[PDB]
Write a protein that binds this ligand. Sequence first.
Ligand SMILES: O=C(Nc1ccccc1)Nc1cccnc1
Length: 152
Amino acid sequence: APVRSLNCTLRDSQQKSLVMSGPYELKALHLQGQDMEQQVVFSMSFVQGEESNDKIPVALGLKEKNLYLSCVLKDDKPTLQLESVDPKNYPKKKMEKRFVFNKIEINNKLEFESAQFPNWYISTSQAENMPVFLGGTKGGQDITDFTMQFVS
Ligand SMILES: O=C(Nc1ccccc1)Nc1cccnc1
C-alpha cells in the first residue's frame, strides 16, 4: 500500500528547536512564542528496513517539500545533508539507505541513527544557531537525544 507518514517537529534534549539555515541546512536554537512558526515540520515516513521493539526505520522529509535528510560521505566523512528528490516518486516505502534513520526509544527520548553509517547520529551542538550534523559519538559533548511533537 502507500507509505505511512506523520507530521512532526523535533527538539533536542536541551529543548532547542530546528529551523532552516539556507536551502540545504538546518540549525538548532532556543525558540519560544511567535518565533516557533519558524521551526521545521517533518514528514516522518515509516520505511522498509531491519526493525525491533525500540528501533524503527524512518525517513525524515520536510513537510510538503521534496527534501529529505540523507547521510553521505562528504570529503571522506559521514555527513548529514538535505537532498532534493523527484516529487513524483517520494515518499516511498523502499527509501534508499542514505535516507533511512533508525528511530530508537531510550529513556523517554529518541535517537536517530544513520542506517547507512552505524553509530552515527543526528546531532546538535550545545551552542545556539549551529548546524544539525551527523556525529559519530552518542557519548557526551554533542546532543544526540530528542523529543517528538505530533503536528495536525
Ligand atoms: O514519540 C515517540 N516514538 C514514536 C514516534 C513515532 C511513532 C511511534 C513511536 N517517542 C518519544 C518518547 C519521548 C519523547 N518524544 C518522543
